[PDB]
Design a protein around this ligand. Structure first.
Ligand code: ZN
Ligand code: ZN
Ligand code: ZN
Ligand code: ZN
Lengths: 67, 68
DNA sequence: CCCGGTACCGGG
DNA sequence: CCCGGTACCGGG
């Protein structure tokens, strides 16, 4: 059907791009950011990803310091 | 604070207007001539699975008795 | 901004 | 009727 754009999918917000024609969806406009489409796109769980990077980062640093 | 859908509409993943329909059963439930019940804790039920499963446990029993 | 958690579309 | 699968609300 009428899928939601990348940003709106990431922010789990109501997207009206499919109605906004070539003009960026309201949301992406209210943020002055390219309203991109990609039926393939999947949301990124930020919070998690960060906790991971911090952990994987410390773990790395720590391991290196072991010399 | 969101408006939950009635049992039947949840079971059928159909648009439910139970709320904006006051005491009168949700549109969908009325047309099906069935009770429009509301239960927050209600979870749908996968029919096709249940059936396929029920047929196996039965057919397994059929082969055992037949294989004798 | 982010997301847990639903409502519901579209199609078989 | 049934559902796979995705849009979006409601809130911190
Ligand atoms: Zn959008
Ligand atoms: Zn957009
Ligand atoms: Zn209903
Ligand atoms: Zn109903």
């Amino acid at each position: 059907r009428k899928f939601a754009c990348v940003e709106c999918r990431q922010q789990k917000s109501k997207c009206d791009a499919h109605e906004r024609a070539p003009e960026p969806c309201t949301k992406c406009a209210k943020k002055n950011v390219p309203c991109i489409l990609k039926r393939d796109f999947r949301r990124t769980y930020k919070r998690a990803r960060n906790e991971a990077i911090e952990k994987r980062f410390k773990e790395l640093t720590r391991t290196l310091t072991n010399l």
